[model samples]
Target: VAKKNQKQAQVKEIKFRPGTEEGDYQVKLRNLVRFLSEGDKAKVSLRFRGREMAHQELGMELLKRVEADLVEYGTVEQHPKLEGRQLMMVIAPKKKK
Candidate 1:
């Protein structure tokens, strides 16, 4: 029996804060591209801490911006949804064909 057809894809989580600097945030974006290009699922979470929770809108905008930036490499399979202080979303790799 052969197992080549049974290879697996891992769901990876990459976390970010609304206040992340653009330079640092772009580096995280590069990581997301790597995963999707390799056909893996990416779970990105925007986490708010303390008083940061008061401005949930910023988190959504940040999440939306990420989706826009990543359109060429992946698609948003799950829209950002709030859970506790985290806005979590899933991105799926576009078919390589």
Candidate 2:
């Protein structure tokens, strides 16, 4: 029998620099969902530009939107919060029997 408590999963960082095209952004989002659905943690980050830093809320909003988009695939491990000039969140797959 397999050990129920065994943790063989790994976390992955889905990096996307600021200003990636909208299509690429969507693709990355899809990849992140796939990773989390496979029992992995996703480090979601959104960077800010020079003037963009003054408006951290924009980044935060974007992160929240991303989290919302991926809600079905995973739950928020860390909610969207401001961290320096970057906004980030973490999500992982829901436990399954």
Candidate 3:
């Protein structure tokens, strides 16, 4: 039973394109929440395109929103940061009692 119950921690990636609608973003957020509840680390990224690169703050804010949404089930392991054209962050599941 111990062998069957043990599962390795996995990293899951969730990518968001600039200009995503609120509803679309919520769907992705829900997916991230579900993944976190399952004890996975989520790599959340926002991709910028064309003039979108000029608005890096937008990407950062979007990532912040994601962090806020997942605060209950996970904690931010990495803050939102710019990596070339992508704004990325890492979130890991909170330890359970």
Candidate 4:
């Protein structure tokens, strides 16, 4: 039965550039919930541009906040990690059952 067909969850991306205004990046949070409900994994990201590299902890804290916020809706497949100029976290959907 084709109803048994397998589907692969694709990776979705949510790019963020930290700003003084939460009004901007908060929009990214909505995108995260949208991705997981579709059965796709999400990549939450934050990137530093050059000199900001020294403040790497800033991104870490933001990513931590992201993880905390998703507690009910998403589960962390991978925690935040640094790769050169960017940091990324992988998240999967969570069902109460």
Q: What value does the lDDT take at residue 10 in candidate 3?
A: 59
Clashes of each: 0, 0, 0, 0
Give TM per candidate: 0.83, 0.74, 0.79, 0.78
| lDDT (tens digit, per residue) of candidate 1 on 12-94 | 88988877898998899989889988877788877777877554888888778789888878888887777875678888888
- lDDT accuracy of residue 78 in candidate 4: 82
At residue 48, candidate 1 shows an lDDT of: 76
Task: Give Cα-based local distance difference scores for all models.
Answer: 0.80, 0.72, 0.77, 0.75
Q: Taking the tens digit of each residue's C-alpha lDDT, what string does model 4 give over 1-97?
A: 2436586346788777765367666667878888888766787877777667554777777878878788768898886777876788888887543
Candidate 3 vs candidate 4: the lDDT winner is 3
Task: Compare the candidates by TM-score and give the number of the best one.
Answer: 1
What is model 3's C-alpha RMSD? Answer: 3.4
Candidate topping lDDT: 1
Please list all clashing residue pairs in model 3, or write none if there are none: none
Better by lDDT, candidate 4 or 2: 4
Candidate ordering by lDDT (highest first): 1, 3, 4, 2
Error of 4 at 44 (Å): 1.0
Alpha carbon RMSD to native, model 2: 3.8
Which residue pairs come into collision in candidate 4?
none
